[PDB]
Amino acid sequence: GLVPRGSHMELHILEHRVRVLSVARPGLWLYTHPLIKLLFLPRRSRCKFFSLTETPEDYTLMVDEEGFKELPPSEFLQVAEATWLVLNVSSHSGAAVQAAGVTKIARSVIAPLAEHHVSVLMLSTYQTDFILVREQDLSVVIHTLAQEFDIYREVGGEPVPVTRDDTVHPIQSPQNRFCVLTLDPETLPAIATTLIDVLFYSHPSSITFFAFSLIEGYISIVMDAETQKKFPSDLLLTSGELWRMVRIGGQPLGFDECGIVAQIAGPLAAADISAYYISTFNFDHALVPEDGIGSVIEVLQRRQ
Amino acid sequence: SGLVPRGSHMELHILEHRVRVLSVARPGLWLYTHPLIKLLFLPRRSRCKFFSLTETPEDYTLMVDEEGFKELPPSEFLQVAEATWLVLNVSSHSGAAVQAAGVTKIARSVIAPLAEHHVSVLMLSTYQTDFILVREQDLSVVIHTLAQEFDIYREVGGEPVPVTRDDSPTVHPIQSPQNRFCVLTLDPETLPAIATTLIDVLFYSPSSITFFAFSLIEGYISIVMDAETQKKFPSDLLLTSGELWRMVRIGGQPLGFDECGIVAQIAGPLAAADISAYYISTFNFDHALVPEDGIGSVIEVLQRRQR
Ligand SMILES: NC(=[NH2+])NCCC[C@H](N)C(=O)O
Ligand SMILES: [Mg+2]
């Protein structure tokens, strides 16, 4: 709520240079060796950005350049053309804002990027909301957001100020209840065998969705409450806040079309609903608090 | 030392497993991480009941039953021995398991006679028991050879069934690396705790040798690892000890699968000297593990002679 008059939030362009990939489910097995390394043995990779998400269609992978080098090319692997940069928002301090804050940046970030034809990919995590943009759009990004945000670019691990350089998609709601969880990285070994089983060895009203990310040492997991029961239940949160999913799109969305996240986040913000938002290679996914799910579906139906 | 009835016979069990013997080149191991993780750690997901992986300087040798073999994609990196192998195990009269590290205790009764009849063997000693692999087509010669001293049973749907009248060259060089080896087991329910360090050791990268063995056969785990590799683990690897083992590597060039008498010319002299041994055959070479303090005596005994 209350803030000083002259004050501006901060937009951080992080160091990461990210490739976005799809691995066909039948080929996943081929990538077990490099993925296990990136998940469980980061003492052996220079990777600092790793996102893996299971959908019905594929496994989408978002990996920094160092992580990308570990992946052998194959006909099972589709690679998005562009290299992507990672945006994050924080308060004037450089202090993290609440998670599930995608709707809080609908008007200030998401709609203005779409208005300037800047395609985004979202990656909400337990800790924060990341927005990925292609390299090519960076100058338009700065143009778009310098008015309201103090923009900082990560150069040698430090935040540095920049100056000049530096249509309506169908929705589904499956019935799964989702948890958004974290875990101490020191606890990863104890969970490793059941995590490997879930990710690598697993065969309309329900959807298969499982998200695991390790970003700068921070672990984020989204899983089915049913899938949670497979683990010791020594995964962390503050709660049982369970979440319901809305999946966005009819056919595969590209990396070119703008305004998708804007259609979802704008109406949801106008209704004061929180959301995590996760983009995969083909589709978008919003996670809204379970008790507000009918109201979400209502609000989204109102867009023309 | 014990006593038994004069007219009693130890039992020879031909187990249910049908085994394939494979070599994976070190540069291609990564391709096999998915099915091997499954066979090691998620045995519920496969019908495999016999799995053995040993790392050497040359390769990774895999011994697996037909059901595990199914899970392994062909590639340039994978060599398969032609034959299907059957698995023999000795027990006492009345079906009881025999002490481990007992290759020398069967040198005279099993090993020498099989070599005398040109039955080529592969040895797999584990923490639990000594397995002797023979090719399927030799089975009737095996029976002829061992029927005299042993009551022979074929395992059929997990039950031992008595067998009736056949029923359903060169002296090799030796080197002992300086490595000290332990033979370990694990409670299967504690594999998860160890999974990432074990994965890291297997899948992620002369006076000493690289040798590591892991087997999971009928729910039982067996591991052989270097004393220094042991330091990378939480120290609930179970043994009876500080009795470490020294390795004698046997052969000067790859030994293949046809030559008989190799295990015999090693286990024979050691039985005469009353020194105990584990014995493990890999795709290229044979390996005896002997008590560390007896190594000089072993080398002595072995240089005296004229798989
Ligand atoms: N492959 C995708 N997930 N595409 C949709 C992502 C969001 C879209 N680029 C936008 O700017 O609104
Ligand atoms: Mg004879």
Author numbering:
A (entry chain A): -7 to 158, 173 to 209, 222 to 257, 260 to 324
B (entry chain C): -8 to 159, 172 to 208, 222 to 257, 260 to 324, 401
Q: How did the manuscript describe this experimental structure?
A:
On the other hand, the CASTOR1 homodimer and the CASTOR1-CASTOR2 heterodimer function as a cytosolic arginine sensor, and negatively regulate mTORC1 activity by binding to and inhibiting GATOR2. In this study, we determined the crystal structure of human CASTOR1 in complex with a tightly bound arginine.
Dimerization buries ~935 Å2 of surface area for each protomer, and is mainly mediated through juxtaposition of the α1 and α5 helices of CASTOR1. Yet, our structure shows that each protomer of CASTOR1 actually contains four, rather than the proposed two, ACT domains. The arginine molecule is completely buried inside CASTOR1, and is located at the interface between CASTOR1-NTD and -CTD. The side-chain carboxyl group of Asp304 and the main-chain carbonyl groups of Gly274, Thr300, Phe301, and Phe303, all from CASTOR1-CTD, form charge-stabilized hydrogen bonds with the guanidinium group of arginine. In addition, the side-chain hydroxyl group of Ser111 and the main-chain carbonyl group of Val112, both from CASTOR1-NTD, accept hydrogen bonds from the main-chain amino group of arginine.
